Amino acid sequence: VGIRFCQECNNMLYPKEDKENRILLYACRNCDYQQEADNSCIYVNKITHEVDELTQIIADVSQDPTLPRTEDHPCQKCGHKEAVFFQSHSARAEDAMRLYYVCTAPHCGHRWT
Amino acid sequence: TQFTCPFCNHEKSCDVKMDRARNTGVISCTVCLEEFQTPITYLSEPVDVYSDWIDACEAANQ
């Protein structure tokens, strides 16, 4: 996306066309500050919402006493046996019975599915 | 849409007309025929126009 604030007055830049050059520019509503765009993309919408939950998974969740932990699935990074596993919360998840594993050992923080 | 007139003090004697083409809100009294025009934004309500008219009347009286 690349949503970028005005350098001078700290406000959202709005996309705009420079018709003489047909060039996308980000311009403040309040000062004349302008910038050249680097993504031609303005509005992007993932309707299917195929969201990768591994971005939102936090390693600190490994400190949860109520979560189940197993050794059958070892870590691919450090090979540690212990790993805590849990499912998704959101209805938007593409797989209902998707299981997410977080490495139990401190500071590996490897997260996979 | 109605308000008490500030000049001829007649309740519900003020009517407000919204002209979005020219972006103006006009309030007219039906008794003393007092006319006031003030620009409006897309988010505007008759209470805003009444507020604008009362501020202008107070400013005119200093």
């Binding site: 996306v1 959202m12 309040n30 949860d64 006493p65 919360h89 | 507020s51």
Partner: protein, 672 residues
């Protein structure tokens, strides 16, 4: 109630100042300050005077009211136009008589021995806990309600709103009632704009106008309070619609006019509008976070958090709050109920005294405070509300909720015991919504599952578990002093740059601060509570891990139960504890010592969500096929999940559950 709450209600009432009309002259001021209460033991006051102590049995026989007179001291300092102050004090001024609860710390039967009670024609087995009024027993049925100062996000069906976030806010039992505030997201031309329904405003206001009115004029500054991680494009693209709706108001004063114009009061002149809106934001919106000369930054942070919570719920990151989950419930017992009633009743007495004093000083002659106060208004008012059951002023008896303070059931001892332990949901009966009536999972160990009336009030009137204990509440000041020693920074000092990685600390619902290390702080707080040093046993501390909130609650009305503590798959209870307890008559080693030893803990529903329980230590904490290796607590005995009437059924696990309910109802009618 009678120890702390009456005193704070009397003292926090504002002093009354009133002058004359300057008759012929067109006139002076005075203060009338109340300062300290003095409560007596119950006394007869028969026709002659000459007080003697009234025994509860005498009150029953002679249809008296077992009440105790209270006295307050008043200093009235009057200045006259000559610039001189005259300060007259009155001690032991008779305000009224409060009905007193039997076997309470102020009853005549407190601390008496069994032989003494038999001398007074009293039953030692009688548990007390009820009032005597006109010689009839009254029991204040506990009334449940939704918790306060906590953000709840719901999603109503078939309304113009997709999601609504509400926070019913209250101060420390101040005069103001619950000042609810709603933050709602519209249900999608272009959409998903966010509006606020704030008190004393006719129309909903977009959130960015409120933020502009609160003192934040820039755009990055406003966004910092709502989106804590600017690297999340989903939140940015979801909030920009409501942001572009506010493209036209770039200063505080215009937004202040915007709020003041939408007032329910008649809306006429600029500065009037400005002052009205500022007052609404200063006192009417969000009181629990602070009502002082400067709380704009703290208020803005809490409002931004509510919007952030709404966005998370609408994005599916979090789940909508459940209205039946007992963590969101609070129980008003005799204390809070009487306090709520007494607050308004004392205000009425002050108003009548003010009216009398004003009438006398209009002529400019002296007023007499002895005749100014009407001792009848408090005493007869309390007697009425506890004798009929209508909780409120008599003049509005239809508006007031009824059913509180029912006649104590005295058919069998089990009936008497059950009636004294009863919770009532203040929802309309004969309703077609069966969700509130269902047995929820969170009733485990706190509300008897078997015992409910089988008539039209199924699932609404519910009895209390045997080991359930309702918190009485305490001041959060010591916890606050402790917290900011342990590397905890208030909002006024932190920058929003580091607000994303750290955990947010809530105390009694108000966002107090932030801390960088969530784990070893919960350990420290747990140690303090197990040592009772600085944190009393009632305080409940809940760490949410997936969502970085960590919450601490000290309110009254939270229900909890005792549980055995486990350390590394081993109980903390040992043979020595049982040995000391078994000889308890000689060593006075009581349950309190067991709590102080760090062996048992009081857990409420919120903390029970984040705990790992064990049904029986020997049978569930052993080397076997591992199910869980991280048990945190253990249960003293499962049979404690039942109530009083359901704890007389032999082999209740060999019966169909409706039969248990019928026996619970029918045990109250067995003659004995």
């Amino acid at each position: 109630f009678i120890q702390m709450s009456v005193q704070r209600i009397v003292e926090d009432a504002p002093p009354i100042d009133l002058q004359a009309e300057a008759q012929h002259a067109s006139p002076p001021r005075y203060l009338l300050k109340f300062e300290q209460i003095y409560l007596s033991k119950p006394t007869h006051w028969e026709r002659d005077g000459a007080p003697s102590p009234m025994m509860p049995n005498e009150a029953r026989l002679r249809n008296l009211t077992y009440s105790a007179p209270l006295y307050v001291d008043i200093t009235k300092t009057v200045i006259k136009e000559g610039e001189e102050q005259l300060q007259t004090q009155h001690q032991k001024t008779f305000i009224g008589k409060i009905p007193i609860m039997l076997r309470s710390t102020y009853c005549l039967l407190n601390g008496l021995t069994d032989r003494d009670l038999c001398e007074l024609n009293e039953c030692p087995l009688d548990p007390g806990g009820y009032f005597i009024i006109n010689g009839s027993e009254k029991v204040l049925i506990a009334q449940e309600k939704m918790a306060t100062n906590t953000v709840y996000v719901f999603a109503k069906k078939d309304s113009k709103y997709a999601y609504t976030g509400e926070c019913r806010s209250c101060l420390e039992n101040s005069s103001r009632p619950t000042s609810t505030i709603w933050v709602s997201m519209l249900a999608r031309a272009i959409g998903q704009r966010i509006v606020a329904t704030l008190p004393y405003i006719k129309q909903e206001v977009p959130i960015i106008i409120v933020f502009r009115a609160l003192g934040f004029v820039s755009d990055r500054d406003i966004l910092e309070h709502i989106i804590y991680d600017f690297e999340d494009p989903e939140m940015m693209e979801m909030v920009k619609p409501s942001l572009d709706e506010a493209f036209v108001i770039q200063e505080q004063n215009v937004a202040l006019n915007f709020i003041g114009s939408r007032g329910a009061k008649p809306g006429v002149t600029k500065e009037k509008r400005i002052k009205y809106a500022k007052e609404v934001l200063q006192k009417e919106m969000l009181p629990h976070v602070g009502v002082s000369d400067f709380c704009e930054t703290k208020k803005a942070y809490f409002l931004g958090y509510m919007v952030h919570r709404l966005l998370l719920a609408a994005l599916g990151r979090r789940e909508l709050d459940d209205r039946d989950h007992y963590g969101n419930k609070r129980l008003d017992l005799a204390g809070p109920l009487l306090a709520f009633l007494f607050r308004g009743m004392f205000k009425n007495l002050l108003k009548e005294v003010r009216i009398y004093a004003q009438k006398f000083i209009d002529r400019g002659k002296d007023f007499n405070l002895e005749l100014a106060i009407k001792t009848r208004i408090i005493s007869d008012g309390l007697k009425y509300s506890l004798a009929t059951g209508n909780w409120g002023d008599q003049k509005k008896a239809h508006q007031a909720r009824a059913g509180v303070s029912q006649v104590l059931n005295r058919l069998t001892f089990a009936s008497t015991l059950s009636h004294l332990r009863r919770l009532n949901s203040p929802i309309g009966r004969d309703g077609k919504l069966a969700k509130p009536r269902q047995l929820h999972n969170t009733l485990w160990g706190m509300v008897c599952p078997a015992e409910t009336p089988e008539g039209h009030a199924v699932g609404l009137v519910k009895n209390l578990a045997l080991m359930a204990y309702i918190s009485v509440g305490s001041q959060p000041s010591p916890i606050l002093e402790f917290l900011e020693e342990w590397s905890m920074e208030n909002l006024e000092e932190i920058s929003p740059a580091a607000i994303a990685d750290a955990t947010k600390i809530f105390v009694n619902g108000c966002w107090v601060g932030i801390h960088k290390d969530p784990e070893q702080l919960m350990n420290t707080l747990r140690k303090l509570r197990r040592q009772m040093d600085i944190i009393v046993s009632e305080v409940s501390m809940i760490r949410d891990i997936r969502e970085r909130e960590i919450r601490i609650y000290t309110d009254a009305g939270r229900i909890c139960r005792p549980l055995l503590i486990v350390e590394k798959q081993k109980l903390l209870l040992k043979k020595r504890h049982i040995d000391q307890l078994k000889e308890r008559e000689y060593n006075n080693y009581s349950w309190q010592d067991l709590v102080a030893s760090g062996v048992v803990e009081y857990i409420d529903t919120l903390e029970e969500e984040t705990v790992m329980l064990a049904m029986t230590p020997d049978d569930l904490q052993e080397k076997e096929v591992a199910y869980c290796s991280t048990y945190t607590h253990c249960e003293i005995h499962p049979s404690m999940i039942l109530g009083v009437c359901a704890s007389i059924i032999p082999f209740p696990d060999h019966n169909q559950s409706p039969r248990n309910t019928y026996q619970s109802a029918m045990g109250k009618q067995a003659m004995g």
